[PDB]
Predict the structure of Listeriolysin regulatory protein.
Amino acid sequence: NAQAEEFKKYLETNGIKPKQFHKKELIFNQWDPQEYCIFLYDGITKLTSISENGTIMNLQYYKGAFVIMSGFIDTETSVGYYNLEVISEQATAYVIKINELKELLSKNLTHFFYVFQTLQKQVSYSLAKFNDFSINGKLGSICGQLLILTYVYGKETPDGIKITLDNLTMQELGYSSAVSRIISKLKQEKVIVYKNSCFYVQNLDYLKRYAPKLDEWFYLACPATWGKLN
Amino acid sequence: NAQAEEFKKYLETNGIKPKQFHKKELIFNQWDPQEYCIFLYDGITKLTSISENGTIMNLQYYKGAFVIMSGFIDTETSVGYYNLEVISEQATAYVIKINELKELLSKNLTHFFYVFQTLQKQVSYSLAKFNDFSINGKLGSICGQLLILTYVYGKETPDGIKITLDNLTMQELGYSSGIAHSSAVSRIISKLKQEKVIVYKNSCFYVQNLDYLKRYAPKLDEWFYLACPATWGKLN
Ligand SMILES: C[NH+](C)c1c(Cc2cccc3ccccc23)cc(=O)n2c1SC[C@@H]2C(=O)O
Ligand SMILES: C[NH+](C)c1c(Cc2cccc3ccccc23)cc(=O)n2c1SC[C@H]2C(=O)O
Ligand SMILES: C[NH+](C)c1c(Cc2cccc3ccccc23)cc(=O)n2c1SC[C@H]2C(=O)O
């Protein structure tokens, strides 16, 4: 991603320095009264919300390079009480106070447009995800998530599509009752298979059949990556 | 909405005239190759997508003032295949081509931030709605939409909180006796009816207990307080 490297070098040249985070660590939390703009350069993270009773809830996965903002760019107040947890072994992120961003982007429109499109990709991602759930319920969601993992971390192999994620990260993503009924169909219809410490997805058309709008979304958002396995 | 007004005259100054749309008109369709930035200034609209079977899907409702963009501002490629239909009897929207938008935002960054914020509000809206659904399922979704409709179109009258919205508009949002409902949905609205949530009085819709809606949709209430605090403070 060229636009991300240009943004990376733009932050370093403006004083903001990278920071390393390890698994289970929170780049920001739902109680911090200071809102930030996170430029997750590398690593996989997880947006969570904790109910006042202690319930944990996952709300979105992010991978670098990408931007995650916990405050509004103008009012600088919270967009919502969330945490950003690192899910992978480690991750690199440029923490930026929400106030320092308005200047960093006011001095450069190319990077301003770059941050803008990250939001648009979330909006269009959400609409596609709400669509596939409206048609296939939880089946469309599960298939949707697998579909994206296959496009991003899948490599063509003579025996399926090798998901290049360590088994620990795969388990952190979800690998009850109706869920048991779903994953059984996936293991039955030759969708996903576990072979020699590696995950392989073979019936990709099954994932596309039940997550259609998400397949469209990834085609228009990451066309280069989409064409590799299509 | 101050930023909306400021953004309106700014568009008119640069030669962008308002355009009127009637109910059932499409501000744009999925097959239009031109990417747009719809600045809906007044009215109500829905974003729709067509499935393979041909079944239309309601994905999102919009009200002015608000922004809806069909192309990525950087690559200028489409974000998806959507239609934008009018729901109210009339609607005012400033249609702007993707290229002409970058020229406008590059001149004045104040409006860039306004549009930037509108997307942020939409991003956190979905996360909150999904959060309420994960906690309360369909019940959270129903109370969520009713909660927002109350904060936006609700006026605290002696007879409760009146939802200032035409009956035919409410009918287009799925609020009318005789609509095709699911068994589970039927039992939810039945309880909402019994416990006085939405009532049909003087042919107008009122909201008796606001606490019930707030209880089973807390994340949307949290969202609306952070996104639209001025409107949230009215009924609190
Ligand atoms: C909110 N949305 C992005 C969404 C959806 C779509 C969705 C489902 C049900 C109700 C919704 C209401 C509003 C907006 C989106 C909704 C599904 C999903 O599984 N996940 C998400 S976030 C992460 C989670 C997932 O991938 O499992
Ligand atoms: C933030 N969302 C919208 C997202 C995702 C989410 C996602 C879905 C399913 C599995 C994931 C695993 C790790 C990280 C994110 C995941 C993916 C994605 O590729 N992009 C995006 S934005 C564009 C694209 C990208 O990272 O380039
Ligand atoms: C675009 N969404 C996120 C939305 C909506 C949509 C909406 C939700 C629930 C019921 C509706 C009924 C009619 C039209 C739109 C609805 C409303 C809203 O006020 N805001 C937003 S963003 C913040 C706020 C606003 O316009 O100020």
Remarks:
- Residues B 44, 61-63, 66, 121-122, 125, 145, 148-149, 152, 227-228 surround BYK (ligand 3) (CB under 6 Å).
- Chain A touches chain B through 47 residues (CB under 8 Å).
- DSSP finds eight helices and twelve strands in chain A.
